[PDB]
Amino acid sequence: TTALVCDNGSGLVKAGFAGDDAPRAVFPSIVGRPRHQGVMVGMGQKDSYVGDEAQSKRGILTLKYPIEHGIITNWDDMEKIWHHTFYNELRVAPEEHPTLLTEAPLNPKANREKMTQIMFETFNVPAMYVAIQAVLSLYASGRTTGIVLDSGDGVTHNVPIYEGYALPHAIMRLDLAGRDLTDYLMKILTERGYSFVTTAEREIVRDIKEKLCYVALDFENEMATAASSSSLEKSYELPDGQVITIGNERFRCPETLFQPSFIGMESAGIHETTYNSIMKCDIDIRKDLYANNVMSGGTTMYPGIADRMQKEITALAPSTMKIKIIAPPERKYSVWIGGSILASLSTFQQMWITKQEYDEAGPSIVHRKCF
């Protein structure tokens, strides 16, 4: 009847119906199991917790992430998360609505093939389609020309599009994302005597990073200010009542996006990646790409990131070139909004991979481009 849009990013599930203005079920992509000693199921105890269930009881659970760097690694956990999303979060029968899914570019084919097999055999979904997140972000922005930088928990990628035409040769992908930033913050916090080693402690540190971290305009001058002044100090209260104080870490943690060498990787910065992606396109396209820079995803929600990137790109680009950074207040749900818009389109109704098409063509039909 009504198509379902479900964005399966790493660490967060956003699902809803096509035509809606926002996803109606948002919860972490985690599975938790008891860790102290064996659970004896002859009586009233459970062994698995999904989403907010694991978050509420994380003090006695070990938390899983089924998706690593945009690749699903634990498929039983994926099936259980899908079942929970389908029967409790949305409490709707899958067999009567087509489902639209999202994936990162340059992923292995086996991931898409397994997703389609599960979506057609375990659940008898009438039809499905897997799209690229950057295209949906551009759809949500309402533009047809621009280069989109999407950064989440596992993957940061750049996709330039010019007036409805993609540029597959200039698509770049980076493995640095929010999870690596959380790990770096956990490592750095040991300098002040704060130790976080468990998965629940990792969730606490992720909350701290979301709440207190920000992007500095100039890193060295900001570091000098933090070394000579204490105006940058912030306080945070732990769940058990302890209070910790954080200083230059607040802007040191997100600095890894522009300086990947902080965690030992040889890659370039996100601004450098965007400039290299733009330079790989034809010379008659670069001006429009400079004029339309779009970010989306949770990792782009740091305060001051847009100004910093505009400064960096202006430094890289020629002086006569005109540049903005487009950072809407709802960058978090841009992929889902674009997916809903696309699923609501009449021209997309021919793109669905139905039951008989998959049954006859086989698994190879996933990489088809109908358009």
Residues in contact with its own copies by CB under 8 A are: 34-37, 42-45, 57-60, 62, 71, 106-110, 162-170, 175, 187, 190-193, 197-201, 204, 237-243, 261, 263-264, 266-267, 281-287, 317-321, 347, 350
Strands 99-103 and 127-132, how do they pair? parallel
Contacting ligand ADP within 201-240 (CB under 6 A) = 206, 210, 213
Which of ligand ADP, Mg ion, its own copies, none does 60 bind, CB closer than 5 to 8 A by kind? its own copies
Q: In the sheet where 127-132 sits, what is the strand order?
A: 25-27, 12-17, 4-9, 99-103, 127-132, 353-354
Q: Which is nearer to its own copies, 20 or 183 (CB)?
A: 183
* Euclidean distance between CA atoms 369 and 174, whole angstroms: 25
Q: Which amino acid is at 176?
A: L
Q: Which is nearer to Mg ion, 78 or 285 (CB)?
A: 78
Q: Which amino acid is at 83?
A: H
- Told to check if 89 binds ligand ADP by CB under 6 A, we report no
Q: Which is nearer to ligand ADP, 65 or 86 (CB)?
A: 65
- Asked whether the beta carbons of 206 and 271 are under 8 A apart, the reply is no
* Euclidean distance between CA atoms 81 and 31, whole angstroms: 8
- Told to check if 332 binds ligand ADP by CB under 6 A, we report yes
- Write each residue from 131 to 160 as x if it is in contact with ligand ADP (CB under 6 A), else as -, in one continuous string: ---------------------xx-------
Which of ligand ADP, Mg ion, its own copies, none does 299 bind, CB closer than 5 to 8 A by kind? ligand ADP
Quote the least distance from Cβ 176 to ligand ADP, whole Å.
12
CA angle 49-50-54, nearest 5°?
A: 60
Structure tokens at 83: 């079942």
Q: Which is nearer to its own copies, 184 or 333 (CB)?
A: 184
- Told to check if 178 binds ligand ADP by CB under 6 A, we report yes
- Told to check if 9 binds Mg ion by CB under 5 A, we report yes
Of 26, 77, 89, 68, the closest CA to residue 49 belongs to 77
Please name the residues in contact with 229: beta carbons below 8 A apart, sequence gap of 6 or more: none
Burial class of 254 by CB neighbour count within 10 A (0 to 12, 13 to 18, 19+): buried
Quote the least distance from Cβ 309 to its own copies, whole Å.
18
Interaction site with Mg ion (CB under 5 A):
9, 152, 297
Interaction site with ligand ADP (CB under 6 A):
9-12, 152-153, 178, 206, 210, 213, 297-299, 301-302, 332
